[PDB]
Amino acid sequence: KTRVLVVGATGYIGKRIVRACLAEGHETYVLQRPEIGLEIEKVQLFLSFKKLGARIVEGSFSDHQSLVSAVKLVDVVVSAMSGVHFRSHNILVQLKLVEAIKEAGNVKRFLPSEFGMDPPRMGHALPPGRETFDQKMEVRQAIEAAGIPYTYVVGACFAAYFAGNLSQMVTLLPPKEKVNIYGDGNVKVVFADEDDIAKYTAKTLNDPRTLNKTVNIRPPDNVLTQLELVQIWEKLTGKELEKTNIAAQDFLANIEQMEIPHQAGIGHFYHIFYEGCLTDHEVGEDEEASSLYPDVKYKRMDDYLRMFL
Amino acid sequence: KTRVLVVGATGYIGKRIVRACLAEGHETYVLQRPEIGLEIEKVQLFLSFKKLGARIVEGSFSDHQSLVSAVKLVDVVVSAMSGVHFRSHNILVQLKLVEAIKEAGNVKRFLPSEFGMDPPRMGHALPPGRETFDQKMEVRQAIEAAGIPYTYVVGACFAAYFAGNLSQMVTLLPPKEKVNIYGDGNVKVVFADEDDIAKYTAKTLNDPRTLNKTVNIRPPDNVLTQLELVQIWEKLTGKELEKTNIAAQDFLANIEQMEIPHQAGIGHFYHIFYEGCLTDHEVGEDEEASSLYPDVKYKRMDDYLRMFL
Numbered sequence: 224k225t226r227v228l229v230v231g232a233t234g235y236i237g238k239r240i241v242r243a244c245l246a247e248g249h250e251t252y253v254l255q256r257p258e259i260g261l262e263i264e265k266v267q268l269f270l271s272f273k274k275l276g277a278r279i280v281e282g283s284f285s286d287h288q289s290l291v292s293a294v295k296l297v298d299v300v301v302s303a304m305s306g307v308h309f310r311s312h313n314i315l316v317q318l319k320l321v322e323a324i325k326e327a328g329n330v331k332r333f334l335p336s337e338f339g340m341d342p343p344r345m346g347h348a349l350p351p352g353r354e355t356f357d358q359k360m361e362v363r364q365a366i367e368a369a370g371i372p373y374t375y376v377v378g379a380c381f382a383a384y385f386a387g388n389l390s391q392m393v394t395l396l397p398p399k400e401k402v403n404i405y406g407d408g409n410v411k412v413v414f415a416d417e418d419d420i421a422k423y424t425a426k427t428l429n430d431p432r433t434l435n436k437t438v439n440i441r442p443p444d445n446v447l448t449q450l451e452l453v454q455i456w457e458k459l460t461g462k463e464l465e466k467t468n469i470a471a472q473d474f475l476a477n478i479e480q481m482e483i484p485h486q487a488g489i490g491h492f493y494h495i496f497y498e499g500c501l502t503d504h505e506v507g508e509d510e511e512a513s514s515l516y517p518d519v520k521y522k523r524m525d526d527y528l529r530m531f532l
Numbered sequence: 533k534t535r536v537l538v539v540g541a542t543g544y545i546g547k548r549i550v551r552a553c554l555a556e557g558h559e560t561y562v563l564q565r566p567e568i569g570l571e572i573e574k575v576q577l578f579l580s581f582k583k584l585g586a587r588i589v590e591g592s593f594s595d596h597q598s599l600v601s602a603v604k605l606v607d608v609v610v611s612a613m614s615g616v617h618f619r620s621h622n623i624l625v626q627l628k629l630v631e632a633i634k635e636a637g638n639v640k641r642f643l644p645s646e647f648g649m650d651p652p653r654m655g656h657a658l659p660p661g662r663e664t665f666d667q668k669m670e671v672r673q674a675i676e677a678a679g680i681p682y683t684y685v686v687g688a689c690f691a692a693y694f695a696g697n698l699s700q701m702v703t704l705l706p707p708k709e710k711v712n713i714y715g716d717g718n719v720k721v722v723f724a725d726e727d728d729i730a731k732y733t734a735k736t737l738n739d740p741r742t743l744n745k746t747v748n749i750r751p752p753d754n755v756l757t758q759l760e761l762v763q764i765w766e767k768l769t770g771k772e773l774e775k776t777n778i779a780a781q782d783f784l785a786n787i788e789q790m791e792i793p794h795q796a797g798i799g800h801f802y803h804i805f806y807e808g809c810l811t812d813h814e815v816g817e818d819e820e821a822s823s824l825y826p827d828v829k830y831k832r833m834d835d836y837l838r839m840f841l
């Protein structure tokens with residue numbers, strides 16, 4: 224039975240990872256930091272984790288030995304550290320965790336906070352959005368310099384942020400009458416339900432086939448253009464939306480005058496929806512999660528959109 | 533089937549009330565405001581309410597006619613509007629809801645955001661903590677000046693904020709070694725698990741016995757002094773905490789130099805734990821929730837504190 228520590232256990236994807244590790248059968252440990260003692264929602268999330276069988280490990284990123292003590296308890300460490308300018312962007316805090324893992328010596332595998340665009344492919348990304356990928360690469364460099372075995376989980380847009388809203392970044396809900404189509408809307412994007420991402424993560428973290436590999440989440444039925452996604456919604460509702468196409472030059476106009484977190488998100492969106500960075504390269508079945516774990520009946524985007532009806 | 537609209541449905545007590553209403557069998561509507569369309573945890577709470585059978589109603593407090601249209605759908609309105617300086621004290625925003633209910637004309641009963649100390653009894657409370665009770669009284673005055681039938685739910689500390697921390701304000705968890713005892717710690721306080729508060733609310737909102745009444749949540753086994761609460765924890769852990777008694781004047785010293793939210797919390801804590809405002813008066817069985825609704829097997833504080841072990 225694999226012992227797993229989740230760092231970032233109350234995060235958006237982190238809490239789903241915790242639940243998936245428990246459902247998968249791992250002996251699941253969660254890092255409870257003292258710094259969140261007055262955040263009721265985080266405190267009660269940890270209580271709900273206990274009720275499911277998780278074990279609470281106290282530790283703080285400002286207490287190096289507490290980190291060393293925590294990772295000594297487990298076989299596998301999964302980090303779900305924050306990495307969005309709109310929420311918080313603390314990817315480099317994981318360097319402290321890498322050091323602790325190096326000192327401890329017992330960790331068979333480390334999964335850093337990846338779960339998105341594939342950082343080594345983003346060398347030409349727009350600033351400031353490119354900071355996300357630069358920092359994740361710095362964490363990759365530290366892992367590999369330390370000889371820590373790893374799995375990098377990448378490649379799919381979170382469904383809540385990109386599918387549930389028909390990729391309109393101004394809201395998280397489907398639009399009522401009008402929709403913006405980015406470019407011709409014929410660039411393929413990868414969408415995945417975050418619960419499937421979590422389940423794939425829990426299955427891969429002790430899979431010999433993905434040791435020291437990048438694992439892509441590219442479920443075939445969820446590789447869709449934005450227009451195909453919109454058309455699903457039109458069919459489910461029986462109502463055509465009024466579409467306005469946004470050319471690339473207009474999408475990026477006056478970016479320098481927007482707030483940093485919005486510039487970052489605009490830049491990421493551009494790489495995904497105008498440059499097709501999630502589909503602009505092939506990946507083999509031995510490095511794709513839905514082929515690797517075919518017992519995961521992943522949620523397709525029509526069933527995902529059905530929850531908004 | 534009573535039709536209920538919950539306003540403040542993603543709130544701390546509000547989400548619990550939505551679930552208690554659904555479990556009770558009410559036809560449960562929830563106000564989804566457009567202003568929270570970019571708050572992922574709220575959006576997904578609404579998705580979770582839909583899955584349980586709640587009906588989504590769209591409206592905004594800046595759109596008076598949307599409020600009128602929303603309350604026209606239901607028999608009963610429950611408001612769980614925020615009311616804590618540390619988390620956004622917006623009690624008076626409810627006046628716009630009262631005005632919409634007045635215009636709509638069909639609402640059989642309104643429960644405003646009470647759920648705490650009994651505001652008419654707090655006329656001598658310390659500033660700025662008295663603002664909570666002053667603003668709730670203004671809402672009561674507007675309800676009654678509009679002729680809207682009402683039920684006011686009062687009288688119990690939320691267990692997460694006052695029991696699970698042994699009433700230490702700096703945290704939401706029991707202390708490891710030391711505990712402050714406020715005064716002699718022999719002043720009776722009322723504690724209630726918030727799921728129970730939500731269940732009593734769901735049961736009372738269509739109870740002819742509580743039309744135009746104040747309903748007290750005062751479960752007899754949960755009327756405890758702070759020392760009794762601490763002794764419950766000591767019995768569960770097997771170990772005694774080192775106790776330091778804090779005299780009233782030392783608790784209040786230099787209150788004027790604290791940030792305003794902390795000043796409010798100190799003042800509220802003072803009335804409860806030093807003046808005994810939740811237990812310094814008696815209430816009848818026909819106005820107390822545990823007698824009115826004996827089938828609610830309310831959680832006692834030993835069972836509550838066990839989830840922290």
Ligand SMILES: NC(=O)C1=CN([C@@H]2O[C@H](COP(=O)(O)OP(=O)(O)OC[C@H]3O[C@@H](n4cnc5c(N)ncnc54)[C@H](OP(=O)(O)O)[C@@H]3O)[C@@H](O)[C@H]2O)C=CC1
Nearest residue numbers: 231232233234235236304305306310336338339379380381
């Ligand atoms: N479309 C996609 O593919 C998406 C990809 N992502 C990526 O997923 C990963 C996780 O992102 P997300 O779920 O939104 O993260 P969150 O913003 O939910 O934060 C995750 C956790 O990071 C911890 N955290 C934040 N700051 C600190 C700090 N200074 N010190 C210690 N811990 C801290 C907290 O852990 P704790 O629980 O202990 O409090 C927090 O819960 C990132 O790499 C992100 O880039 C995210 C959104 C979209």
Ligand SMILES: NC(=O)C1=CN([C@@H]2O[C@H](COP(=O)(O)OP(=O)(O)OC[C@H]3O[C@@H](n4cnc5c(N)ncnc54)[C@H](OP(=O)(O)O)[C@@H]3O)[C@@H](O)[C@H]2O)C=CC1
Nearest residue numbers: 540541542543544545613614615619622645647648689690
């Ligand atoms: N020990 C006790 O007895 C306690 C008593 N209370 C009392 O409980 C009641 C609810 O408190 P609590 O659950 O902490 O509230 P929250 O802080 O969780 O907020 C509740 C809801 O208020 C809505 N809200 C906040 N600001 C606005 C605004 N400008 N306009 C419209 N809606 C707004 C939101 O509704 P939405 O869901 O639509 O976004 C929010 O979810 C209060 O009266 C409080 O005093 C609370 C703490 C302890």
Ligand SMILES: COc1cc(C[C@@H](CO)[C@H](CO)Cc2ccc(O)c(OC)c2)ccc1O
Nearest residue numbers: 307339340379380384392393394487488491
């Ligand atoms: C696919 O890979 C990634 C994707 C992301 C998405 C981030 C980008 O900043 C944010 C949300 O956190 C998306 C977002 C931005 C603005 C919006 O108005 C918006 O509306 C819902 C959604 C981050 C990291 C990744 O590796």
Ligand SMILES: COc1cc(C[C@@H](CO)[C@H](CO)Cc2ccc(O)c(OC)c2)ccc1O
Nearest residue numbers: 616617648649688689693701702703797800
């Ligand atoms: C019993 O009646 C009420 C009680 C309350 C509790 C409020 C008071 O501000 C807050 C939480 O929201 C309590 C709190 C304050 C500071 C803290 O450090 C703290 O540690 C957990 C807890 C509000 C309204 C009421 O009518």
